[PDB]
């Protein structure tokens, strides 16, 4: 037996930006899906495409674990078929997998302001893509000036803000089931 490293994915000290999330291929292991189901340390925990309770006794070829940080009210944009700043710029309607989001004020928001999303893009992001801005006729040559600006506003996170204005860490469980050999079930 060789347990899957879901502990170090959910318990990673520092995550990445929403525009630069880290896809994490997890395979060749055994996943105890009951840990995620019965932790109670998760603000939001929902999905479709697979039975959440009976997901334990099913295996797939590989497991993909997205990981990024968004605001409290922006957790709605991490669902299939959603419109928003994060959804359209930073999951397909046939997504089979679960999205797990929890509160991370004490770890991403500091008293002085850690300040460690993408606001502008000509084309909306196609599913499972990740992008790492001309707003007029003026073809700016690389100077962030008139009608041209940086496409990245840094997040502002402090413990003083409200529930939906606070940082949230999101892990998306993306199960793929290609015709290869499945290797991850408990």
């Amino acid at each position, epitope marked *: 037996t060789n*347990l899957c490293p879901f502990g*170090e994915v959910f*318990n990673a000290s520092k995550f990445a930006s929403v525009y630069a999330w880290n896809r994490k291929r997890i395979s060749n292991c055994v996943a105890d899906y009951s840990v995620l189901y019965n932790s109670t340390s998760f603000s939001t925990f929902k999905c479709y495409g697979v039975s959440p309770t009976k997901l334990n006794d099913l295996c797939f070829t590989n497991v993909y674990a997205d990981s990024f940080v968004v605001k409290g009210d922006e957790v709605r944009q991490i669902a299939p078929g959603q419109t928003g700043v994060i959804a359209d710029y930073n999951l397909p309607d046939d997504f089979t997998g679960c999205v797990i989001a929890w509160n991370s004020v004490k770890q991403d928001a500091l008293t002085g302001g850690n300040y460690g999303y993408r606001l502008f893009r000509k084309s909306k992001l196609k599913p499972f893509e990740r992008d790492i801005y001309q707003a007029g006729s003026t073809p700016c040559n690389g100077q962030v000036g008139l009608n041209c600006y940086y496409p990245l506003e840094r997040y502002g996170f402090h413990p003083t803000t409200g529930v939906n204005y606070q940082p949230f860490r999101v892990v998306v469980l993306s199960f793929e089931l290609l015709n290869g050999p499945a290797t991850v079930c408990g």
Partner: antibody
Amino acid sequence: QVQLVQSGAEVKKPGASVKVSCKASGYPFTSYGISWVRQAPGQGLEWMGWISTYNGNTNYAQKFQGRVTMTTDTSTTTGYMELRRSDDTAVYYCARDYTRGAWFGESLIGGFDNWGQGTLVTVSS
Amino acid sequence: EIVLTQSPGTLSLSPGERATLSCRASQTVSSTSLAWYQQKPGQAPRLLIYGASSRATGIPDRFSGSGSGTDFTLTISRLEPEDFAVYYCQQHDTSLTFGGGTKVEIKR
């Protein structure tokens, strides 16, 4: 209820190396890493290194870059530690690591838990 | 490196008093990569706090840790007879660094 047990006290001269075993039982041995801390008598804790029980990668401290060697056996759930002086006379501790991750290698939310009893190593001519 | 400077080196409080042990870093350590360790004399180190605020399983409630940025503090709300030991702070933001220790002595 996991316990880590180390080897008995072994003394040497300021020549060759001493080796300490550390067998754990109670957790998946390849799920959590192992760390080593050195504490001289009358002194505090001094970190030595870190090892991954899944991939085998080692992150030794800056002091022991070129002296210490760490290996673990996946079968016996045992982690080994070897330091290739009288200055190093101390008690070597073995602990379960939750700060660097066993599979990937990223910093985690945790510390060192379930320490061993500590192997007494004295080096004197 | 990031150096953890603890002060005072030796603390003296009678049983029942409130203890406020502090750990200071030479740089800015992430609020997650900092752990407190208690070591009773003649025994092994015991994990108290991880993430600078979260206690390890089995640790009592009187051991509450806090801090952020460069200044961090471990607080023992009600000192108990077994709480008199040597305490350390450890950060793994940049490699790994321990502290000099803070012995908690019985005042008489």
